[PDB]
Short mmCIF file of C-alpha atoms in Angstrom, two decimals:
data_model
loop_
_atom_site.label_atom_id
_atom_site.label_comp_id
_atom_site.label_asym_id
_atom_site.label_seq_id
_atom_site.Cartn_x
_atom_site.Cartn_y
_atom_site.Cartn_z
CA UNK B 1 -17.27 -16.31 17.01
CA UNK B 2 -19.49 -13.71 18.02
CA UNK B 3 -20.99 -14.71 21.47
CA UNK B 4 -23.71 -13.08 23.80
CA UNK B 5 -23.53 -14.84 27.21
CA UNK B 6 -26.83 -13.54 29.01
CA UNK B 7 -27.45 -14.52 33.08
CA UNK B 8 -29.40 -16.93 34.63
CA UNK B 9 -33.75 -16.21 34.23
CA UNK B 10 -35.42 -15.12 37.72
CA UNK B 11 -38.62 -14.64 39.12
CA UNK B 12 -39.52 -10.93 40.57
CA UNK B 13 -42.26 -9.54 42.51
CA UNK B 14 -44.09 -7.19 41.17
CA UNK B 15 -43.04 -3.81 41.63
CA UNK B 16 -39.74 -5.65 42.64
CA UNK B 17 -35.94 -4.61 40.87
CA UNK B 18 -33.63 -6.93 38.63
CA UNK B 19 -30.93 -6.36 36.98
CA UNK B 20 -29.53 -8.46 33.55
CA UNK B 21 -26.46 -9.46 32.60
CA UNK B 22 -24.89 -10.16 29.00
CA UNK B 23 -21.05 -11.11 28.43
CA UNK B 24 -20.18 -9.98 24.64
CA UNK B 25 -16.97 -11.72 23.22
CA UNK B 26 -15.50 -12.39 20.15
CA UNK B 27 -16.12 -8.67 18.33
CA UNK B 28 -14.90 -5.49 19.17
CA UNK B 29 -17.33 -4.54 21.84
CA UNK B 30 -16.61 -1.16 22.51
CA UNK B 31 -17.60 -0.56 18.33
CA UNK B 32 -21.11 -1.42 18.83
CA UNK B 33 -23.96 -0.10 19.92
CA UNK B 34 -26.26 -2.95 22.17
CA UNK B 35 -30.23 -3.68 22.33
CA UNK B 36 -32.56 -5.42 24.91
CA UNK B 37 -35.97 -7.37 23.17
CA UNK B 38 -37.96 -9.05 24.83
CA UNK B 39 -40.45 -11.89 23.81
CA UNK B 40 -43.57 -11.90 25.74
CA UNK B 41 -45.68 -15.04 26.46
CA UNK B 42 -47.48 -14.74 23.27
CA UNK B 43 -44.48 -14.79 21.26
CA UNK B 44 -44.23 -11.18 20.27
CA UNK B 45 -41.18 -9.37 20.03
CA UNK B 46 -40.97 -6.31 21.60
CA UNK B 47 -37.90 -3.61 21.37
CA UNK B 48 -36.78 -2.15 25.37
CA UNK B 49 -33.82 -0.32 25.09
CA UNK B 50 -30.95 0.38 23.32
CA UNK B 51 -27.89 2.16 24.12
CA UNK B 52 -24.50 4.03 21.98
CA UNK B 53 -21.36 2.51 21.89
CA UNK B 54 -19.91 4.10 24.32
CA UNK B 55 -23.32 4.58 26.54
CA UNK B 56 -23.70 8.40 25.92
CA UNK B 57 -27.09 7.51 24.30
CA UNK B 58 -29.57 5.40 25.88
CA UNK B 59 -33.18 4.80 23.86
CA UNK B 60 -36.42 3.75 25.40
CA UNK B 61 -40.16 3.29 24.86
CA UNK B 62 -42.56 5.20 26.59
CA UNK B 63 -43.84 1.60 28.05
CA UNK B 64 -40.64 1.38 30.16
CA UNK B 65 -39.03 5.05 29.74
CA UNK B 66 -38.17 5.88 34.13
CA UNK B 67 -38.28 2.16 34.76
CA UNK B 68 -35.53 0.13 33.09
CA UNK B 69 -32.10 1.63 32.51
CA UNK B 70 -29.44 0.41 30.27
CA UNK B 71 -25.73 0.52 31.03
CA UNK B 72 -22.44 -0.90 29.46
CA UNK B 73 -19.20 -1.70 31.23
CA UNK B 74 -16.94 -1.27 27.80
CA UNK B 75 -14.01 -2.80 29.80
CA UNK B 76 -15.87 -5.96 31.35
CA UNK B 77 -17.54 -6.12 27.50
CA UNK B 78 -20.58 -6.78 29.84
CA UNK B 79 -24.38 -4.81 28.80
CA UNK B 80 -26.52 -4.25 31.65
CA UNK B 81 -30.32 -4.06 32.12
CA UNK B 82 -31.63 -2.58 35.28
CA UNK B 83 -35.42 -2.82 36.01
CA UNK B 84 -37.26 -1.39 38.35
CA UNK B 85 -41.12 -1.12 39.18
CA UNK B 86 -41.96 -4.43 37.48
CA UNK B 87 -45.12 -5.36 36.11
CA UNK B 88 -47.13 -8.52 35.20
CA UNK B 89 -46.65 -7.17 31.77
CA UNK B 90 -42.76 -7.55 31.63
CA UNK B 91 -42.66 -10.77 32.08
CA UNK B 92 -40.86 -11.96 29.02
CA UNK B 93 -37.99 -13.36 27.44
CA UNK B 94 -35.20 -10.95 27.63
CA UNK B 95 -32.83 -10.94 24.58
CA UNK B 96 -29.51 -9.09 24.28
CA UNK B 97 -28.86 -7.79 21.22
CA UNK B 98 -25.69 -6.04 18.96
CA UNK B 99 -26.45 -3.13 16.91
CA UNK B 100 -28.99 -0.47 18.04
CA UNK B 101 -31.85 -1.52 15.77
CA UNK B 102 -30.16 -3.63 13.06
CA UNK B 103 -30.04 -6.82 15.81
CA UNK B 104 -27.29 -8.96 13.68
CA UNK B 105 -26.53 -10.95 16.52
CA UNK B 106 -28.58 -12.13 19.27
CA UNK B 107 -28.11 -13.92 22.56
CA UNK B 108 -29.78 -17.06 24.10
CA UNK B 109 -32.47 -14.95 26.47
CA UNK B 110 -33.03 -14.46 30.06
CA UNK B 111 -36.71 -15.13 31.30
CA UNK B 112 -38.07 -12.94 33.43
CA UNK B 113 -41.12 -13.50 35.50
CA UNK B 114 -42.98 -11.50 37.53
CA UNK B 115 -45.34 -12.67 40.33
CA UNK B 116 -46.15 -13.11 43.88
CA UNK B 117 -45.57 -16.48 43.59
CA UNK B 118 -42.53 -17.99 45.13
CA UNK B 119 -39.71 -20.52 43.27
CA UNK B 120 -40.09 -24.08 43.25
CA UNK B 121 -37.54 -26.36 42.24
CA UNK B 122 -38.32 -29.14 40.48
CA UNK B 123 -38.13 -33.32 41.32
CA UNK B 124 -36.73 -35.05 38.00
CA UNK B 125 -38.02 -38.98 37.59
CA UNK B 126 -37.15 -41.43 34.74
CA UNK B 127 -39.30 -42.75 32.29
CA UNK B 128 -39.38 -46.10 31.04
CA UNK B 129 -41.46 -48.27 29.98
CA UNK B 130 -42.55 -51.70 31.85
CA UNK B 131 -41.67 -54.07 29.42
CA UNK B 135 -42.70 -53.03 18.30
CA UNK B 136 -39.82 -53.96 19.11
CA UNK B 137 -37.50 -51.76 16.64
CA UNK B 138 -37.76 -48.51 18.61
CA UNK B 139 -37.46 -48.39 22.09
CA UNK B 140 -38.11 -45.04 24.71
CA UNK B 141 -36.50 -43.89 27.70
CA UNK B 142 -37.73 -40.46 29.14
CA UNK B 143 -37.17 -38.07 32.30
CA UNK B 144 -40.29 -36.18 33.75
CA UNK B 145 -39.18 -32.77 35.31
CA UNK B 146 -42.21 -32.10 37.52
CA UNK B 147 -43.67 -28.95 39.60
CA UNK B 148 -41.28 -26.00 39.35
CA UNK B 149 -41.53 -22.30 39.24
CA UNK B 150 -41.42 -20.25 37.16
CA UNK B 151 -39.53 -21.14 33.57
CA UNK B 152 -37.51 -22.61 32.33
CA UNK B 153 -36.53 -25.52 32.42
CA UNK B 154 -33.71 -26.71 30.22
CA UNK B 155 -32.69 -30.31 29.13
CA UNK B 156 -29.87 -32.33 27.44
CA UNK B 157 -29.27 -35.78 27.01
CA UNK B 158 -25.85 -37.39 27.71
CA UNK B 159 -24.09 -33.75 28.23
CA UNK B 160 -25.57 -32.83 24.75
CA UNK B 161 -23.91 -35.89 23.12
CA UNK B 162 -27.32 -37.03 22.21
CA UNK B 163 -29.50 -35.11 19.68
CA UNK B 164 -31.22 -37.63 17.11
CA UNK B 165 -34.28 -38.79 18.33
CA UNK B 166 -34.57 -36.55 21.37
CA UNK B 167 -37.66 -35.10 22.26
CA UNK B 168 -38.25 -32.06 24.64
CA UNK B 169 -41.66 -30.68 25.04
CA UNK B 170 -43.16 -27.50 25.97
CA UNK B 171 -44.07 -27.36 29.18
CA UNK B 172 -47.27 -27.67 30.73
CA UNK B 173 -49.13 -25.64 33.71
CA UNK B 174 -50.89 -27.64 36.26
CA UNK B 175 -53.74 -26.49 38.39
CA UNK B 176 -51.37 -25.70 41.39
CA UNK B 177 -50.10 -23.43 39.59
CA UNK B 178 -46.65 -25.17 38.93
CA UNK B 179 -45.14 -26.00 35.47
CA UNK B 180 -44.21 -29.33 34.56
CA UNK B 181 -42.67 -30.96 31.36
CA UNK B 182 -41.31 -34.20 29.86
CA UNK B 183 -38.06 -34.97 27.84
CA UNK B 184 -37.67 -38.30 25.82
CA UNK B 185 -35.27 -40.43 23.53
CA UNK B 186 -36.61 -42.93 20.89
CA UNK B 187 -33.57 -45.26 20.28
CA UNK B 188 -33.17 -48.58 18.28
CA UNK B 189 -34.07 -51.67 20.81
CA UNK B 190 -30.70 -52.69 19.82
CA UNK B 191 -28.68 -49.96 21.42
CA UNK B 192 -30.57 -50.70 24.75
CA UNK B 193 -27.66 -52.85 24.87
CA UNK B 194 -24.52 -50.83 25.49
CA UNK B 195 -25.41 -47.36 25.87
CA UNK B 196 -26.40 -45.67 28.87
CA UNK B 197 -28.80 -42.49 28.60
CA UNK B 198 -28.78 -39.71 31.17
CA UNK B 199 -31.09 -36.07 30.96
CA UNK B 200 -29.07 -33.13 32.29
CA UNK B 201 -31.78 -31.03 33.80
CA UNK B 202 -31.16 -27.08 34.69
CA UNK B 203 -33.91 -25.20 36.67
CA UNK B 204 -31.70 -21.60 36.95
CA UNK B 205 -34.30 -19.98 38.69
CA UNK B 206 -33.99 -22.46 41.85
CA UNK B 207 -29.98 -23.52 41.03
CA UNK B 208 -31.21 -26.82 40.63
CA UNK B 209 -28.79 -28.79 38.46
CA UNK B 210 -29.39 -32.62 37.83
CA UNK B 211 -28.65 -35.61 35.96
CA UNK B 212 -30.45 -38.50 35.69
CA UNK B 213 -29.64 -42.02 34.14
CA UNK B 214 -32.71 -43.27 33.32
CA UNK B 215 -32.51 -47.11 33.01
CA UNK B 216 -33.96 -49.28 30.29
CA UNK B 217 -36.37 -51.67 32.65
CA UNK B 218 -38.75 -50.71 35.28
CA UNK B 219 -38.00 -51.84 39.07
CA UNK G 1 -45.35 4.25 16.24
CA UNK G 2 -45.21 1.87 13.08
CA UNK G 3 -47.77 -0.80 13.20
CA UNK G 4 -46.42 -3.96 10.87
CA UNK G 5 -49.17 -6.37 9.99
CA UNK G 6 -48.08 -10.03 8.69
CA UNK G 7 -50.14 -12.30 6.42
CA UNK G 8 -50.42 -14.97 7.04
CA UNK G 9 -49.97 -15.57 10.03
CA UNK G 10 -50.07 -19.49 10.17
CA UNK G 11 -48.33 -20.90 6.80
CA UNK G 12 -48.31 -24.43 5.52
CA UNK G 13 -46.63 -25.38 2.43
CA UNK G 14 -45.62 -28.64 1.18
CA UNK G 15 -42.23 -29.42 1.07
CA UNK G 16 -39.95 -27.85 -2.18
CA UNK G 17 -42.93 -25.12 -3.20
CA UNK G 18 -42.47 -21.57 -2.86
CA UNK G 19 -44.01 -19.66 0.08
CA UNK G 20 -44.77 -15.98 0.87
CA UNK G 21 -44.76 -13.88 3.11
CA UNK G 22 -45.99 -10.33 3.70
CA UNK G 23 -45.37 -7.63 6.27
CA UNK G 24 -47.58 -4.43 5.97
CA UNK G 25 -46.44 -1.06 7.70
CA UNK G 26 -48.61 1.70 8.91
CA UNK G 27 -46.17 4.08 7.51
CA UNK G 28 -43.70 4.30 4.73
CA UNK G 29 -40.02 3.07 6.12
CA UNK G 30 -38.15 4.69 3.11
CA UNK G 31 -36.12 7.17 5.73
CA UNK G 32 -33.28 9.59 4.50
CA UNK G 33 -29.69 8.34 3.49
CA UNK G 34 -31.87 6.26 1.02
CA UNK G 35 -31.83 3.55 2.73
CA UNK G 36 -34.12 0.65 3.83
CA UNK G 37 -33.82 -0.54 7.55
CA UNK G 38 -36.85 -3.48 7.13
CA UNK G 39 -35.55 -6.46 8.28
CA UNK G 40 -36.68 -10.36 8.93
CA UNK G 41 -35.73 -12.70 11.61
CA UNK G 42 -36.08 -16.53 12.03
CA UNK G 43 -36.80 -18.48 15.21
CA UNK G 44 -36.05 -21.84 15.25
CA UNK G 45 -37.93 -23.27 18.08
CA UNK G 46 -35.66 -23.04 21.19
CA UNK G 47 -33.73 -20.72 19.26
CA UNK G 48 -32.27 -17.56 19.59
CA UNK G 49 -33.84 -15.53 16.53
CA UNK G 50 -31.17 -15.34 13.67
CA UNK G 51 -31.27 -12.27 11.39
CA UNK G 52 -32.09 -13.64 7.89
CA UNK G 53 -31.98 -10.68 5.85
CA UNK G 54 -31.61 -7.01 7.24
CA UNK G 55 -32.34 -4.73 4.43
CA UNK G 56 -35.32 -4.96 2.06
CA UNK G 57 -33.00 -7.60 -0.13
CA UNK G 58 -29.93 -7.98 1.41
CA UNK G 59 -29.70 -11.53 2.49
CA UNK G 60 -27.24 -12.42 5.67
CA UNK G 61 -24.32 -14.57 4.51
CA UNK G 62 -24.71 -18.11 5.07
CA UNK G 63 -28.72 -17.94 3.88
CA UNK G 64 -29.38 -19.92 0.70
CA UNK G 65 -30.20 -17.86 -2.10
CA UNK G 66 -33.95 -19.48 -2.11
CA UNK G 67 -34.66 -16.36 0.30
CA UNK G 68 -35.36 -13.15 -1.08
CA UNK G 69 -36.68 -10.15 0.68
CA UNK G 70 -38.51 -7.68 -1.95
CA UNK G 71 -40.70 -4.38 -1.17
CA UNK G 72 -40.87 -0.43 -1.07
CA UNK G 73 -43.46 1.48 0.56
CA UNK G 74 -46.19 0.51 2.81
CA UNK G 75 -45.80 -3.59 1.57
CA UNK G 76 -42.84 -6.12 2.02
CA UNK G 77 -42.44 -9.69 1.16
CA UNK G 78 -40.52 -12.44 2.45
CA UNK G 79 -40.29 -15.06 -0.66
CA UNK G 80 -38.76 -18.70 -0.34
CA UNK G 81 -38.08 -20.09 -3.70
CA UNK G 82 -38.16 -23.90 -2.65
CA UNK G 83 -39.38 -24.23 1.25
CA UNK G 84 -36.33 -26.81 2.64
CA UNK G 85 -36.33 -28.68 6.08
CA UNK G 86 -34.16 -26.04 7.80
CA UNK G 87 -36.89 -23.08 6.89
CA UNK G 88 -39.74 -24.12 9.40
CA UNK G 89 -39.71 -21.46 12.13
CA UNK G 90 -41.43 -18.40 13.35
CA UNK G 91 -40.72 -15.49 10.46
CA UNK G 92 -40.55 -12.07 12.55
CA UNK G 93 -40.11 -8.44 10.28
CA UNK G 94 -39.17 -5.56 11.59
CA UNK G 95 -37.97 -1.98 11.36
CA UNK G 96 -35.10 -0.81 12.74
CA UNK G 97 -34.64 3.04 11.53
CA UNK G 98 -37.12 5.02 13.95
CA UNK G 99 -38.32 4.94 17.67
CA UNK G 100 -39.28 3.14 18.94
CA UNK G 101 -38.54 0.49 16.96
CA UNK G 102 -41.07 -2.27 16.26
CA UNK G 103 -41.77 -5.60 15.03
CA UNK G 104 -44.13 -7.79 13.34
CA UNK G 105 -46.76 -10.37 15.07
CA UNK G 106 -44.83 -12.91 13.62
CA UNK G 107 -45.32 -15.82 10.62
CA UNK G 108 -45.47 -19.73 12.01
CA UNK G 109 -44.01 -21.69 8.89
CA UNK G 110 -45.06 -25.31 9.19
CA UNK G 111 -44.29 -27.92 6.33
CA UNK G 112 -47.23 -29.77 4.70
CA UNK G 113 -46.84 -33.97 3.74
CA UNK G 114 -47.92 -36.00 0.97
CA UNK G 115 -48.47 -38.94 3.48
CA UNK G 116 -49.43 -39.86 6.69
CA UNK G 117 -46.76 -40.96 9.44
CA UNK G 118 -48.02 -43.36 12.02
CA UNK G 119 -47.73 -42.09 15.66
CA UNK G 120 -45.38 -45.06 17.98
CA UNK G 121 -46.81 -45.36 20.93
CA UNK G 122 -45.46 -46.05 24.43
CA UNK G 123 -46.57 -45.58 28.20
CA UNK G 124 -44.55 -44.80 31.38
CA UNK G 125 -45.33 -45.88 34.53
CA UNK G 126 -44.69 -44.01 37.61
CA UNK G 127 -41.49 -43.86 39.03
CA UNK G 128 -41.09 -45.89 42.21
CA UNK G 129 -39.63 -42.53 43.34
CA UNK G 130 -42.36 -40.69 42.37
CA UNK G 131 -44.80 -43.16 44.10
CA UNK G 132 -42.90 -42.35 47.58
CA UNK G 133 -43.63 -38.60 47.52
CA UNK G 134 -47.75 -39.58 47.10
CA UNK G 135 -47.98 -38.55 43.14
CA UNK G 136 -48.18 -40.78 40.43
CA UNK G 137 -47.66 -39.29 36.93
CA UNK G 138 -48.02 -41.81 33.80
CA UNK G 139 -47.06 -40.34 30.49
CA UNK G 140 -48.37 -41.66 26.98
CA UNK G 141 -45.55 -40.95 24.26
CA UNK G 142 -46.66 -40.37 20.48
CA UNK G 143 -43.43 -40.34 18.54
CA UNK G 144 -42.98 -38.84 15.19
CA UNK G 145 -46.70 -38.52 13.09
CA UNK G 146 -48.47 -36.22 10.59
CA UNK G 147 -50.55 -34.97 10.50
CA UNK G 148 -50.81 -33.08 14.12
CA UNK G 149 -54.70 -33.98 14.72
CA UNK G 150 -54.43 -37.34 17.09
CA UNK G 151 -57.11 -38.37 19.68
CA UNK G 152 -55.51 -39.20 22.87
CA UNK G 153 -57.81 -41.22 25.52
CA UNK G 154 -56.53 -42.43 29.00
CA UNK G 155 -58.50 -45.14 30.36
CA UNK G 156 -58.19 -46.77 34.06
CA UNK G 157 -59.89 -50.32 34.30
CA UNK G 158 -61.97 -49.09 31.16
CA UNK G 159 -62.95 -46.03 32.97
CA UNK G 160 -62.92 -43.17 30.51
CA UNK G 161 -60.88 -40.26 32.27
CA UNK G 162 -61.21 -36.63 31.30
CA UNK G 163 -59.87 -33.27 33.28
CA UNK G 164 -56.89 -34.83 35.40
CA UNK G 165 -54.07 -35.20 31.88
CA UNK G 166 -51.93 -32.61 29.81
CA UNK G 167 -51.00 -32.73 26.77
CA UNK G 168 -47.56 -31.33 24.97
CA UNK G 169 -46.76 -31.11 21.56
CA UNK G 170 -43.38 -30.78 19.95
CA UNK G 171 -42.93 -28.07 17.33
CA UNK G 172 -42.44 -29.63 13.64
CA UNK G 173 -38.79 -31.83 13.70
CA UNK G 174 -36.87 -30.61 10.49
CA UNK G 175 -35.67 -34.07 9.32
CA UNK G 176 -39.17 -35.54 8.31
CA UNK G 177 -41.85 -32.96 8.70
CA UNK G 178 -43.50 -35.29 11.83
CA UNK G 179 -44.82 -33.94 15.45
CA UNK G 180 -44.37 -35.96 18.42
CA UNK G 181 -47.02 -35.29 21.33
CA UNK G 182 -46.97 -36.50 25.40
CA UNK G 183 -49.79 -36.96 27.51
CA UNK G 184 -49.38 -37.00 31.28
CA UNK G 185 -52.09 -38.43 33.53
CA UNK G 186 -51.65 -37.47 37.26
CA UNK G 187 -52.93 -39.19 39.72
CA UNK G 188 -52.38 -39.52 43.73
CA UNK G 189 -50.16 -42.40 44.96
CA UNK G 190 -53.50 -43.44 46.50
CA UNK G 191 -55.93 -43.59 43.90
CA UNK G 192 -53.12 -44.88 41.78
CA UNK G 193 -52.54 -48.21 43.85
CA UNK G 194 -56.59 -48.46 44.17
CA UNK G 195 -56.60 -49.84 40.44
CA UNK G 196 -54.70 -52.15 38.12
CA UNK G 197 -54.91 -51.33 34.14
CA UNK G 198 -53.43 -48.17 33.01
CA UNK G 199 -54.28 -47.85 29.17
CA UNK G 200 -53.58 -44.78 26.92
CA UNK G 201 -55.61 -45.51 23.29
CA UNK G 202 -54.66 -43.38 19.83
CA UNK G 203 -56.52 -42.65 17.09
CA UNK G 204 -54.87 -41.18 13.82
CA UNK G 205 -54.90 -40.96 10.53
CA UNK G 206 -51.76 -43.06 10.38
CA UNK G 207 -53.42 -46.13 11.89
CA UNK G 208 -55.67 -48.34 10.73
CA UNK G 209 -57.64 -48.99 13.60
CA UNK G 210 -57.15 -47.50 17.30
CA UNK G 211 -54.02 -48.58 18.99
CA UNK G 212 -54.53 -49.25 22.88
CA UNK G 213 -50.76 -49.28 24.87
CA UNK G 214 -51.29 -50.44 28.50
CA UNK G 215 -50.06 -51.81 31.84
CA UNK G 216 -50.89 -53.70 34.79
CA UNK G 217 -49.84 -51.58 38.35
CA UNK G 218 -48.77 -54.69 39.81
CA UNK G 219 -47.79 -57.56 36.89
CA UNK G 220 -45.14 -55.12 36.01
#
């Protein structure tokens, strides 16, 4: 199973330095040349370097040719992306990619934002209601963090049908917030128990939450 | 650098008809070896993009055969014999032959229903743990309608609010073709305890008349 294991997203001044991470396994590594896209906030997909198998070729655009440099440990089967001299205009999703421009596999992307602003981790608080009667609604409210994302799960990703994660929002403060919910049959209020796994990276905030079916 | 233009860029088609779409490039991308290099991507939302077909019309194993990529020259097309659940998504093209390589804006493929699907409706409270820190957030939850137009209206003790909620929308769900939307009105811990009903009222094409869901800050 091919698999592109990319590191944690971060938040960068501008003009600051990162560098990204992305563990290849299950293909021959060393056969393949490797590619960095990025998505930027508007969705559009832009190409930022790609590199030879064995990293005697390295390819840029001019937009970030003597800022970003691509590198490959062949033994680790690790591909690297250093950047340097940052701009409000990298901030993006950054996806690794196998093959140099023929992208057949892609990872899970890295977010990278750049600002002045610092990182806020965010405060996680159930939602339920204080009460038709067929479906019922439990929720968790992950509130003021910087920058994205956020990621959530329900029951350690036991729980897909009827789970509902929205995009987030961006309050005045300037902080991000978003909402996660599960529409269940009242009947399983019963006997199961429902718990969001929330995962702010940016901060190393990790939490779950069991959210319980009556208010206090 | 090769400019690719797609059209359209929103597209809605009802469930099981075909649906088209076309990626234009500045420049021919016929190179030398004879050989093609246009390619087209899905992204599921919260997805990874997942290469659908990588030549003109070589389709990716595992893709139904209702995809077929077509094209020479300057104009390409993305065709979908019968549009299923699992085909909504964000339809990228791209070419992958010469520097720097480049993409297209990107195609939003939305499915289209014969009939409406009534929004359920619930509200949140705040947390009592949220009430400590001095916020109070209450959330109005419309599961699972279509079309995506709803009203949403907060009202405190009939007071109509406007300028302190959000609201979120989830992308299409693949199972029934419905959205589901949340509305968060924030308030402070103290202007929350300085009134009593809470009320978030929906109007959509799914229900017959306005449907008002509400609390009481302290009867609950």
């Amino acid at each position: 199973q091919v698999q592109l294991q990319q590191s944690g997203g971060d938040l960068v001044k501008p003009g600051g330095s990162l560098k990204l991470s992305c563990a290849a396994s299950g293909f021959s590594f060393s056969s393949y040349g490797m590619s960095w896209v990025r998505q930027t906030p508007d969705k559009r997909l832009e190409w930022v370097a790609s590199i030879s198998s064995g990293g005697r070729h390295t390819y840029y655009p001019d937009s970030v040719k003597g800022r970003f440099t691509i590198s490959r440990d062949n033994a680790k089967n690790t591909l690297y992306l250093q950047m340097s001299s940052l701009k409000s205009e990298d901030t993006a999703m950054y996806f690794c990619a196998r093959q140099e421009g023929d992208y057949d596999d892609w990872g899970q992307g890295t977010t990278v934002t750049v600002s002045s602003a610092s990182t806020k981790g965010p405060s996680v608080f159930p939602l339920a209601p204080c009460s038709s009667e067929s479906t019922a609604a439990l929720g968790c409210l992950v509130k003021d963090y910087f920058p994205e994302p956020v990621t959530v799960s329900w029951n350690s990703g036991a729980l897909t049908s009827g789970v509902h994660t929205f995009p987030a929002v961006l309050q005045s403060s300037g902080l991000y917030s978003l909402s996660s919910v599960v529409t269940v049959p009242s009947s399983s209020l019963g006997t199961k128990t429902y718990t969001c796994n929330v995962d702010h990276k940016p901060s190393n905030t990790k939490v779950d939450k069991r959210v319980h079916h009556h208010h206090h | 650098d090769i400019e690719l233009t797609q059209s359209p860029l929103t597209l809605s088609v009802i469930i099981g008809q075909p649906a088209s779409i076309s990626c234009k490039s500045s420049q021919s991308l016929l190179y030398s070896d004879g050989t093609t290099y246009l390619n087209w991507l899905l992204q599921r939302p919260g997805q990874s993009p997942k290469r659908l077909i990588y030549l003109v019309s070589k389709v990716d194993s595992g893709v139904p055969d209702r995809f077929t990529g077509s094209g020479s020259g300057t104009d390409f097309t993305l065709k979908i014999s019968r549009v299923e659940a699992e085909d909504l998504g964000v339809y990228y093209c791209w070419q992958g032959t010469h520097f720097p390589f480049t993409f297209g804006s990107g195609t939003k493929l939305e499915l289209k229903r014969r009939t409406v699907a009534a929004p359920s409706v619930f509200i949140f409270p705040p947390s009592d743990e949220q009430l400590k820190s001095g916020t109070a957030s209450v959330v109005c939850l419309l599961n699972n309608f279509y079309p995506r137009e709803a009203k949403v209206q907060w009202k405190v003790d009939n007071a109509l609010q406007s300028g302190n909620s959000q609201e979120s929308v989830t992308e299409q769900d693949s199972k029934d073709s419905t959205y589901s939307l949340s509305s968060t009105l924030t308030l402070s811990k103290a202007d929350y305890e300085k009134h009593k009903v809470y009320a978030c009222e929906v109007t959509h094409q799914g229900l017959s008349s306005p449907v008002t869901k509400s609390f009481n800050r302290g009867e609950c």
